[PDB]
Paper text:
In the type I-F system, several Csy genes comprise a silencing Cascade complex with the Csy3 protein as a backbone-forming molecule. Among them, four genes of Csy1, -2, -3, and -4 (ZmCsy1-4) appear to form a silencing Cascade complex in the type I-F CRISPR systems. In order to provide a clue for the assembly mechanism of the Cascade silencing complex of the type I CRISPR/Cas system, the crystal structure of ZmCsy3 was determined.
There are seven ZmCsy3 molecules (ZmCsy3.1–ZmCsy3.7) in the asymmetric unit, and their structures superimpose very well onto each other, with a root-mean-square-deviation (rmsd) value of less than 0.2 Å. The monomeric ZmCsy3 structure is composed of ten α-helices (α1-α10) and eight β-strands (β1–β8) and forms a right-handed glove that is composed of a finger of several α-helices, a palm consisting of a β-sheet of 6 β-strands with an extended region (web), a thumb composed of a two-stranded β-sheet and an α-helix, and the backside of glove. The surface potential map reveals a positively charged surface patch within the glove and the inner sides of a finger and the thumb, and negatively charged surface patches on the backside of the glove and the outside of a finger and a thumb. The seven ZmCsy3 molecules in the asymmetric unit form an inter-molecular helical structure. At the inter-subunit interface, a thumb of one subunit interacts with a finger of the neighboring subunit, and the β-sheet of the five β-strands on the backside of one subunit comes into contact with those of the neighboring subunit(s) through many polar and hydrophilic interactions. The inter-molecular helix formed by seven ZmCsy3 molecules is part of a long superhelical filament structure in the entire crystal system, where seven molecules form a single turn with a diameter of ∼95 Å and a length of ∼82 Å. Since this molecular-helical structure is formed in the absence of crRNA in the crystalline state, there is a possibility that ZmCsy3 can be aggregated at high protein concentrations to form a molecular helical backbone of the Cascade effector complex without crRNA. The hexameric molecular-helix formed by ZmCsy3s, except for one ZmCsy3 subunit at either end in the apo-backbone structure, superimposes well onto the PaCsy3 helix backbone in the holo-Cascade structure, with rmsd values of less than 2.51 Å among the aligned 1912 Ca atoms, and only a negligible difference at the crRNA binding regions.
Author numbering:
A (entry chain E), B (entry chain F), C (entry chain G): 10 to 343
Write the structure that this text describes.
Amino acid sequence: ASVLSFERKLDPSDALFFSGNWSNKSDDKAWQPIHLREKSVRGTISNRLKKGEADPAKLNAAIEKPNLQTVDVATLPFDSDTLKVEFTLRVLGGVGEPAACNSMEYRSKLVATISHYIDTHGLDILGNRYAANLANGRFLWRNRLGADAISIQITRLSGDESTLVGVFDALAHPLRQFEEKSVSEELEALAKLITAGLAGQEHVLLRVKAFIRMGEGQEVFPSQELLLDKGKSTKSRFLYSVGQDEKAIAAIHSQKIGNALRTIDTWYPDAEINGPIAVEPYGSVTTQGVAYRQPKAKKDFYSLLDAWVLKDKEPTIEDQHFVAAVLVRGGVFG
Amino acid sequence: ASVLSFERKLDPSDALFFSGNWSNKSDDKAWQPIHLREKSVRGTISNRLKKGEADPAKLNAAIEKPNLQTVDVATLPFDSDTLKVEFTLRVLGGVGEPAACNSMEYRSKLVATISHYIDTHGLDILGNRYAANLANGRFLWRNRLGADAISIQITRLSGDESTLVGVFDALAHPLRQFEEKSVSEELEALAKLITAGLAGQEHVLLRVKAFIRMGEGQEVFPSQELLLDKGKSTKSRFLYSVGQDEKAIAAIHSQKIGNALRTIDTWYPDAEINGPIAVEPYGSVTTQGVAYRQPKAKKDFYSLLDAWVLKDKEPTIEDQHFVAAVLVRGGVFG
Amino acid sequence: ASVLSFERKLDPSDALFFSGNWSNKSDDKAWQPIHLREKSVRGTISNRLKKGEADPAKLNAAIEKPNLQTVDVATLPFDSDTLKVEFTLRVLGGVGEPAACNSMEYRSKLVATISHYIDTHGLDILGNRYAANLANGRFLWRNRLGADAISIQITRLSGDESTLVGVFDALAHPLRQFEEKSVSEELEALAKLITAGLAGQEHVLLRVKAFIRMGEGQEVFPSQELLLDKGKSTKSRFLYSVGQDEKAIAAIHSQKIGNALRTIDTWYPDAEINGPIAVEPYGSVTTQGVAYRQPKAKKDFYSLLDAWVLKDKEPTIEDQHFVAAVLVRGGVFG
């Protein structure tokens, strides 16, 4: 075939953690950054035991060996009760244009297939569900669980201009389904902004500001970084941070914020049982270790695209939406 | 096989130390924070000796040697007799939902059995005993011993509002049994609140303010940090603290506070002599280097949970209380 | 084998220096803190020389190089003739309850062994001998030598109220033996008070106020703080102080006060030849670099404790008092 490779058109930045009180969301200088700290942890024997271990003497022996570790932790201060998560989002047009492609015959029918898809059903639901996942706060991941209150401030930036698009209560919007009426005037302005940017009509740059009321001293949940037994350190858990040594700030990986944004695919076989999942070529969910959209039940990105392009096996309108959502997510495809 | 994880449902913050005088409990300004200090210690040869040597000559050579060390110390001022320990606690619903699950047929039967548990024997005992361990001050660890008077103020935090749940005399509540029929209305209000949170009905954020009258200038006991012989410092003992650099405040580790709340398990084989212990999959007790709840006796959390779910072997109702209590603790199980 | 550790049950605070005149001991606001000062000191070649160094020109040269140092110094004011030393003492029960132990068999007979010892010959003598070391002012250490007078006011505090246990005359009490049979009623009061606290009967909080008349402007003696070329200080002597920065108060280390309280061991082999010593597991004494109770002879703590507990070889009554005495000193016996 061809060795294509599309570029992501959703470009979120890392989301950095900031701490303050709830009554001062509008006051931008009222939010100090959250830095990582280290603390000692006395481990516990909690994993399933091996076949050998069984015997009470060696379980017991295991419990007396110290098992102590050091972990990263990020928390709100004793006097500040509200996490603040800020990141910018860039939506780019050109979703139908490959950035690389090795078969001249394959490129031609692809762009046509997408172009007329764009032409027919304007990719509004793509923008609508992206938009929705800003308003859910789904990109907060573990920080939304247990929140007293979550208010999300979205603005558009152009030059030196900021424009309030919307202030969404993340807990007033569903995570398991997408609202299809009566939405909101403010939500809808933001789905049309993202769709315009997806399409090419506008230059779109958003500034998200999520505010979670967690309670003084409460632990916040940045991303994890994985580099175990790196020599003398031998620290148990490492969190993610941005900005060099003392200044560095706790953050969620940009791609984790992205993974949340594209969790849209309600269009796969078991979609009513498992709710929405994140658009991936093979509808893979890493936690559950299973692939919705298996290749044998031809509903993966790949089988569908050849059908829809190489053979003109037109697919259903939702699966058509899905393969657009992969091209929006993008990635080397071969 | 099934591989799966559960996230904590009881979420206490670090517990920070403050100082002041017992009269001014209600005045929140009257409490200045406790910072760590360093002090020299001329050490003693106090450990058990090896083969080389119990010879008189080399023992005495060893005592001649200076053996000076530096240690962190936290203590009350010369003019302040009471230690304040403050922390907030969040209680999350969703006990039965695993955070990650490998096999979704195992999830189905797991969420099935736990949901049945919640409906039948409502998790009232769990919130009964978590509540108790707040009301008795078990979370004060070594700071409870010898206290003149411990008064524990607990309050519900709901957006901007703060409502007082109860003021508890921690020396009036047992640490070896959990109280019966006539609990107290204040304790009972609190135990309901924790189970509503455990059960998803309410958003519960509590603020524990614990006052221990100890006497002016008396040493207090934060957590320890285990970094012994790291660097040229040659420091004998590190203590735990939270907050930037010099204004950092001495603290108990959040997970030490949660070990206290989870000391509810009176359901293991020898419990009537040993007393309650903190919930742990293999019923482990680190200070005694022994694992109650051995796998030989199939009383460990895995024997229990496997049986209950894969083979529909109902365990004794106390043992059911235990694995539900493990599930709120959380861990990585598989 | 056992990996026990006992928490200390004698808990004195740091002792802080104040200064005033001898008439006003009863006026608490008539005493003002002693802050440390720096002064310059031109050194002197006073140590023993080393082969090479003994040549005349070499030592002659050694004399002429400045040798200039800075030292901390604490003194009474020009108008204030009396040093006042205040600390608070907590006495805890639970002597025979280890805070940690590894082998379940060892805890078993240990608690029985110690329990019975308490049951039989009650630890009155331990209380008597601590008691006396408050009354002889041993804890004043170098501030005791060459004093016009020494008045030690002891009170017990409970709640908001203080009861005068006694006013002792530390120079009318011996250091080198403990007084024979006939002892003051007030000393008797205090020895019963410490034993009740060691036993568990009462909550014991004492406030010791020692007054030493030494003459206007005289140098007082706090503990020493020992750091070796920490920074570019080149300050040869540092003393201990407690408090913020420049209103920190000269002090004796708490554990120095404690070591003086447990100066009770008249029970080693050479006890008539050397008098009392502070209770250490191997009867060590830092100044003399000697280990009384060497382990060759089976009179150290640990040889004794295994014999008395493991093999039921009960030891001499006086050495049983010692073994109990280490247990209230406490500390990791690894």
